Ligand SMILES: *[C@@H]1O[C@H](CO)[C@@H](O[C@@H]2O[C@H](CO)[C@@H](O[C@@H]3O[C@H](CO[C@H]4O[C@H](CO)[C@@H](O)[C@H](O)[C@@H]4O)[C@@H](O)[C@H](O[C@H]4O[C@H](CO)[C@@H](O)[C@H](O)[C@@H]4O)[C@@H]3O)[C@H](O)[C@H]2NC(C)=O)[C@H](O)[C@H]1NC(C)=O
Ligand SMILES: *[C@@H]1O[C@H](CO)[C@@H](O[C@@H]2O[C@H](CO)[C@@H](O[C@@H]3O[C@H](CO[C@H]4O[C@H](CO)[C@@H](O)[C@H](O)[C@@H]4O)[C@@H](O)[C@H](O)[C@@H]3O)[C@H](O)[C@H]2NC(C)=O)[C@H](O)[C@H]1NC(C)=O
Ligand SMILES: *[C@@H]1O[C@H](CO)[C@@H](O[C@@H]2O[C@H](CO)[C@@H](O[C@@H]3O[C@H](CO)[C@@H](O)[C@H](O)[C@@H]3O)[C@H](O)[C@H]2NC(C)=O)[C@H](O)[C@H]1NC(C)=O
Ligand SMILES: *[C@@H]1O[C@H](CO)[C@@H](O[C@@H]2O[C@H](CO)[C@@H](O)[C@H](O)[C@H]2NC(C)=O)[C@H](O)[C@H]1NC(C)=O
Ligand SMILES: *[C@@H]1O[C@H](CO)[C@@H](O[C@@H]2O[C@H](CO)[C@@H](O)[C@H](O)[C@H]2NC(C)=O)[C@H](O)[C@H]1NC(C)=O
Ligand SMILES: *[C@@H]1O[C@H](CO)[C@@H](O[C@@H]2O[C@H](CO)[C@@H](O)[C@H](O)[C@H]2NC(C)=O)[C@H](O)[C@H]1NC(C)=O
Ligand SMILES: *[C@@H]1O[C@H](CO)[C@@H](O[C@@H]2O[C@H](CO)[C@@H](O)[C@H](O)[C@H]2NC(C)=O)[C@H](O)[C@H]1NC(C)=O
Ligand SMILES: CCCCC/C=C/C/C=C/CCCCCCCC(=O)O
Ligand SMILES: CCCCC/C=C/C/C=C/CCCCCCCC(=O)O
Ligand SMILES: *[C@@H]1O[C@H](CO)[C@@H](O)[C@H](O)[C@H]1NC(C)=O
């Protein structure tokens with residue numbers, strides 16, 4: 001049934017927004033790590049900043 | 050609001066092969082690999098007079114103050130005035146036929162002089178390097194981090210400049226010149242992170258163990274067998290392989306830890322409570338939820 | 339001069355422009371110890387001097 | 388150098404090389420790689436995962452690979468007398484190492500099977516471990532012009548102690564000139580042997596050096612760089628073994644490390660061998676069992692490793708229970724794209740056919 005499928009799609013759009021929000025914190029954007037703690041541990045100024 | 054520190058008692062890394070005897074020529078470089086050990090960095094640095102360093106994705110001070118899964122050192126006798134021939138993208142014979150630095154892991158290149166009285170390292174008669182290596186010309190170039198295919202042929206020794214050796218298929222040529230003054234060396238250092246259940250640590254970074262029993266459910270800094278971070282710990286039913294000691298999720302974030310006390314702890318990043326403010330402009334008063 | 343290394347400015351710009359203030363620290367130092375003054379050095383110069 | 392023990396003296400035992408009795412249509416027992424059981428999969432280093440599915444890039448066998456079969460045999464025997472050894476021609480075959488390999492050991496133990504030496508006799512099958520030589524350059528054995536000689540430093544891996552120990556050493560192999568030895572005119576193959584009447588008589592007096600003593604008759608060991616040994620619990624369970632090499636040395640893996648009733652292989656040693664390994668050869672074994680006590684030995688199977696992407700499923704306890712080889716077919720690619728073993732019915736676009744120059 002199309003209507004029930006639409007219900008599930010509304011729920012899934014809500015869930016996907018949050019999941020995409022959380023996943024972006026694992027993007028390095030070309031840095032050596034996506035974790036600030038690792039960056040502070042491995043490098044020194046000015047390369048750190 | 051606290052610290053959680055657990056470390057195993059380990060032996061000391063063995064640097065004696067590097068500190069005794071004669072360092073080899075560059076094409077026959079020696080490699081050392083260390084795991085699950087501690088070493089005295091301050092002592093090692095005081096044996097040498099560094100003339101230059103260049104690092105990639107790591108810094109020497111971080112190597113002095115943190116731990117890593119493994120530590121690899123390649124070393125050889127090398128004249129400091131040939132420094133530019135070891136740079137990345139160099140076009141000369143050093144990179145083609147003797148040593149090519151790999152950049153797949155964090156790495157640092159160090160040149161140094163051995164003081165005359167300080168150490169037990171002995172001088173070779175000559176510095177030496179290969180000028181060509183070819184199959185009969187079909188040149189054979191070094192892979193990054195690898196040895197020249199001509200290594201066996203070159204072990205016959207070189208007595209004069211531009212002396213050649215052949216075995217019928219391979220041919221190589223060598224260049225030699227005398228050592229003058231203090232001996233000079235090169236070191237190529239690389240490390241790895243998170244590939245072992247134990248670590249390699251400089252002695253200056255070691256600290257006394259502490260317990261987590263009175264620090265549950267609050268944000269603490271932790272150092273567990275060399276793996277460091279911030280997080281909140283909670284006692285949990287055991288999951289995963291205890292002998293692997295660390296449990297991770299699909300994003301390669303730490304989510305669990307098997308302690309040597311026998312318990313398993315769930316690990317979470319430090320959290321913050323939401324705050325909302327209710328403000329009425331007319332009365333200029335506020336409340337919080 | 340035997341070497342220079344600058345951060346977010348260049349010597350020619352210092353020669354041709356003005357600034358709010360100028361601070362100079364100076365000392366006797368052997369040029370063959372140059373690498374011990376580099377950022378991220380692990381030696382005694384950065385730790386204690 | 389390290390001490391390799393007492394130098395050998397005397398003569399080598401003759402071997403009869405007869406491949407037509409080993410690689411035969413009656414002795415073909417194919418076993419392929421079954422990814423649904425995650426056969427031949429090395430476990431990742433330094434971590435574990437619980438109750439999740441994920442993709443992982445590493446060194447893995449190809450799905451449904453048949454690999455290569457090897458079988459060992461008893462030597463010739465008559466009531467009261469022990470005679471020549473009986474082997475295939477594995478000692479003269481040289482294989483490319485490439486990215487390494489994995490080995491399935493003792494899969495047919497507990498089944499009745501042939502005693503290769505006698506095409507009619509049947510026995511219950513027993514597990515037997517392989518032995519290897521690995522090196523950087525190869526040549527001919529000098530007198531006979533028979534292939535398979537390893538020059539310069541050679542890595543040797545050699546089981547011993549009736550299955551309770553394995554040696555691992557890196558030394559130059561210097562041939563001896565005595566009868567049937569590697570430098571003689573009567574040499575046919577490098578065949579190591581043990582005598583179970585005097586070596587494996589009692590579980591409290593297993594001879595831990597018999598295979599090493601036999602190897603030393605073929606060669607004098609010179610300028611060895613290292614000598615290690617690892618203790619093994621004796622049983623009849625099927626096992627997996629693996630070997631790779633990278634910048635940090637040669638790595639060895641085994642399913643015995645954590646739980647021998649699961650088939651995941653775990654790292655257990657690293658060897659300081661830094662020059663690239665290019666060649667390996669199986670060292671044939673031949674058991675000098677007495678005529679009254681004759682046995683059949685389980686075949687073993689070697690599968691090559693490749694750099695591939697795999698989909699891995701972890702259970703709650705942390706073991707890998709099943710896997711998908713992403714590059715096997717289009718469905719496997721769809722499953723790897725969704726990071727799931729369960730996909731919905733549909734029509735999906737997947738990675739295009741690869742175009743390389
Ligand atoms: C499993 O693997 C280990 C490690 O390789 C083997 O252990 C070695 O075994 C050999 C014997 O085969 C030992 O060798 C003997 O060492 C005696 C003392 O050595 C001292 O110095 C060495 C070198 O620094 C140290 O490693 C050692 O701890 C001691 O401090 C020597 O006195 C012996 O010499 C005499 O016997 C030999 C016999 O061949 C004669 O040739 C000599 O002339 C002399 O008469 C001998 O060298 C060696 O020390 C052991 N190493 C360790 C670390 O324990 C195991 O044997 C092996 N187990 C197996 C295969 O079952
Ligand atoms: C890493 O390696 C370092 C170098 O080996 C280690 O440092 C050395 O550690 C030893 C042991 O603590 C020190 O030795 C002692 O030094 C004191 C002080 O000596 C000075 O004063 C006395 C008079 O009081 C004088 O006689 C000396 O000449 C000195 O002027 C002595 O009193 C002791 O008897 C003993 O010699 C070394 O001094 C010290 N070296 C340096 C350069 O600091 C370090 O401990 C290692 N780290 C680890 C964790 O192992
Ligand atoms: C050949 O036969 C022997 C004997 O039957 C096999 O060994 C036995 O195999 C069973 C089944 O895997 C093992 O059972 C398991 O034992 C563990 C012990 O902790 C238990 O936790 C499991 O639930 C299960 O009961 C048994 O222990 C094992 N015996 C020995 C001595 O290891 C052997 O596996 C057979 N080989 C082949 C190739 O089939
Ligand atoms: C080892 O033995 C096998 C079996 O005899 C050899 O393979 C055979 O080689 C002959 C001669 O070229 C071929 O005609 C057969 O077809 C081969 N048999 C099979 C099953 O492929 C093999 O060449 C030998 N290896 C050596 C001598 O190194
Ligand atoms: C090792 O021995 C093999 C034979 O086992 C040699 O191959 C022979 O090469 C000669 C000279 O080119 C040919 O005439 C023969 O026909 C070859 N024999 C076979 C059976 O193929 C080989 O040259 C030797 N290798 C080395 C490195 O000396
Ligand atoms: C590696 O093994 C080869 C083969 O045994 C050695 O080769 C001989 O070396 C001597 C001395 O240089 C030469 O006179 C011979 O002509 C070589 N034979 C061949 C077939 O090349 C070689 O020396 C060994 N290399 C090392 C580093 O020991
Ligand atoms: C095994 O190692 C020994 C010790 O290094 C080697 O003997 C040396 O050989 C060189 C080259 O012939 C000589 O210049 C030295 O004088 C020898 N030293 C000693 C202490 O004897 C020997 O060559 C090596 N054996 C091999 C490679 O087969
Ligand atoms: C001293 C060389 C002078 C050459 C003058 C003109 C050359 C024509 C083109 C040359 C290519 C550039 C090579 C630069 C060498 C850098 C040193 C090194 O890569 O190690
Ligand atoms: C000359 C040092 C040779 C040490 C060889 C191997 C060391 C093991 C690990 C060392 C950490 C790297 C220190 C690099 C020093 C750079 C100079 C500086 O920071 O000022
Ligand atoms: C750390 O432990 C050792 C051994 O018990 C002790 O000697 C030392 O004083 C401790 N250090 C601190 C700072 O408590």
Ligand SMILES: *[C@@H]1O[C@H](CO)[C@@H](O)[C@H](O)[C@H]1NC(C)=O
Nearest residue numbers: 262283284285286287312313
């Ligand atoms: C943590 O949980 C385990 C298992 O539930 C329990 O046995 C253990 O005592 C707990 N630890 C503490 C300190 O209470």
Ligand SMILES: *[C@@H]1O[C@H](CO)[C@@H](O)[C@H](O)[C@H]1NC(C)=O
Nearest residue numbers: 288437438439701702703704
């Ligand atoms: C494991 O994962 C499955 C699938 O999401 C889930 O239903 C199940 O509850 C999990 N099991 C445990 C023991 O956490």
Ligand SMILES: *[C@@H]1O[C@H](CO)[C@@H](O)[C@H](O)[C@H]1NC(C)=O
Nearest residue numbers: 527528529530531532533572
């Ligand atoms: C091995 O080959 C050589 C030629 O290289 C030949 O003189 C010798 O007789 C051969 N040996 C045998 C046993 O065939």
